[PDB]
Structures are given as structure tokens and as C-alpha cells.
Design a protein around this ligand. Structure first.
Ligand SMILES: *c1ccnc(NCC[C@H](N)C(=O)O)c1
Length: 275
């Protein structure tokens, strides 16, 4: 029942069309689909085998080049699952296969059907005490209002996110009351806003690389604090900061290929606690 406790994870295999057709905020180097497929299999392995979570592996769909990023299509809090309306219209078909799996796990399903509301799960930070929803090109006020209406036990606040980013492109929960946050002025300005509207001031773990602030914190039975972070090969300066967590079981998980299409650690799984 502790924060970050999960029993199940929903993931989705990446399709071959990802390398060429997955949306990306910036032109860059060519995506190695084989290596990305390799890194995704290592990611699922950490959640499923190394950590014992019950993994629902959804099949790829070549017509949905971004279907690997299941986090955008669902926000899960306790037994309630919010099926979002992704801001990219072409991604909204990834919702059908996620809803089918979330109700087989017997969660209370709420679908964001409002044709004026968009929300990417990647814009939602759940601190265990409240929600923060980034207002980006993908997530609008209506979508944030619908999330607030879906989890009325928890406070919801919004924070402006700039450019083609998500909120969790520069932050994530690194532990109980611990927010990993980037060192840029953009990230610190957003954190300054979030700490303002909260009735609680969090501890922060500042990393020199915004993207490396995206980590997966987990509380596993008979293991305790577990954190998946980017490798020292990718972001050595931020990996050094994570090594300070002496009571965390640290796991380096690479994501260098999917990062080319703005894919981070939190985007590739929906974590669920089923008692
Ligand atoms: C995780 C964190 C931040 N943003 C995302 N979005 C997925 C990227 C995808 N190619 C897209 O929809 O742009 C995931």
C-alpha cells in the first residue's frame, strides 16, 4: 500500500513502422529499430522478471507507430483507470487495445470522450499525494479538468510546459516525497510553480540532464526502494546523482533509441497496484 507499489505493468511491443513513422519533436539520427526492440525487451524484462510484476504485453500494430508509449493512453490511480484522449489525433486509436486490457484487470474505466479535451499521460505526474498535469501542445485545460473529475480524492494542479515536451520530460517521482527534476531553467521554473500550489513541499533530486530526470520508482515487496534510471553510458553526470540513493536498488535501463522519438522510461509502461 506504500507509494510506488505496483503488481502489474501494461506494455506494448513497438512496431516496425516506428523507426520511420513515429512522431518526433526534432529531426535527428536514424532510429535503429532492432536496437530499440532490444532495449524494449530489456525494459520489459526488468519489470517482469527482475521485479516480479505481472506484465501484460500488448501486441504491436504497424499502423500505430507510437503504440509502444502506453503511458500516454492511460493514467491509473488505485483501482481507477483514466483512458485519455491523446493530443496527437493519429495516436487516439492506441486507446482501444489499452482499454480492453485495463478492464480485464478489472479497473474502473473512465474514457476521456470530450472532443475538446486532450491529455497525454506523459504530462501527468502523480506524487502519491496529488497530481500535477502539464499544459503542453498535447494536454489542454479540459483534459486536466477531466482528470481532476476522475480522481476527486486527489488534488490536481497544472503547470505550463513549453515547446514539444511533456511534463515528465524533465521530472518524475524518484521515491516517497522525492521528485527527480532537471537542472535547466525550464525544469526549475516548472518545479517552482508546482511547489507553490502544493500543501506539501517535496524533497528534490536535481540531475544535470533533464531527460535523465525521467525514472521509474517502484516499491517491491521484500526489496523496498527500486529505481530504474538511464545508464552511465547515456547520462553519466545524472547517473552519478542517482548513485547517491544508498537505500535504493538502482537499475540502469537504456533507452537511447526510443529517446530519438521522445520516448522515456516512464512512457513505456502503465503501472498498476492490484491488491
Ligand atoms: C514519454 C515522455 C514524454 N513524452 C512521451 N511521448 C511519446 C513520444 C511520441 N513519439 C509522441 O507521441 O510524440 C513519452
Amino acid at each position: 500500500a506504500a507509494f510506488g507499489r505496483a503488481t502489474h505493468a501494461v506494455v506494448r511491443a513497438l512496431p516496425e513502422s516506428l523507426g520511420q513513422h513515429a512522431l518526433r519533436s526534432a529531426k535527428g539520427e536514424e532510429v535503429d529499430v532492432a536496437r530499440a526492440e532490444r532495449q524494449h525487451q530489456l525494459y520489459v524484462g526488468v519489470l517482469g522478471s527482475k521485479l516480479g510484476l505481472q506484465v501484460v504485453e500488448l501486441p504491436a500494430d504497424e499502423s500505430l507507430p507510437d503504440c509502444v508509449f502506453v503511458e500516454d493512453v492511460a493514467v491509473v490511480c488505485e483501482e481507477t483507470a483514466l483512458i485519455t484522449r491523446p493530443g496527437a489525433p493519429s495516436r487516439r486509436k492506441e486507446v482501444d487495445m489499452m482499454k480492453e486490457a485495463l478492464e480485464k484487470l478489472q479497473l474502473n474505466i473512465v474514457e476521456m470522450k470530450d472532443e475538446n479535451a486532450t491529455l497525454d499521460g506523459g504530462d501527468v505526474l502523480f506524487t502519491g499525494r496529488e497530481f500535477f498535469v502539464g499544459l503542453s501542445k498535447r494536454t489542454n485545460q479540459r483534459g486536466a479538468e477531466i482528470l481532476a473529475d476522475t480522481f476527486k480524492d486527489y488534488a490536481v494542479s497544472t503547470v505550463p510546459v513549453a515547446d514539444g515536451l511533456h511534463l515528465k520530460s524533465f521530472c518524475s517521482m524518484a521515491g516517497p516525497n522525492l521528485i527527480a527534476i532537471g537542472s535547466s531553467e525550464s525544469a526549475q521554473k516548472a518545479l517552482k510553480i508546482m511547489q507553490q500550489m502544493s500543501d506539501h513541499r517535496y524533497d528534490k533530486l536535481t540531475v544535470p540532464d533533464d531527460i535523465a530526470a525521467n525514472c521509474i520508482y517502484l516499491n517491491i515487496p521484500n526489496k523496498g526502494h527500486v529505481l530504474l534510471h538511464r545508464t552511465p553510458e547515456e547520462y553519466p553526470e545524472s547517473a552519478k546523482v542517482y548513485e547517491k540513493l544508498k537505500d535504493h536498488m538502482l537499475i540502469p535501463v537504456s533507452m537511447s533509441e526510443l529517446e530519438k522519438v521522445d520516448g522515456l522510461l516512464t512512457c513505456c509502461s502503465v503501472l498498476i497496484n492490484k491488491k
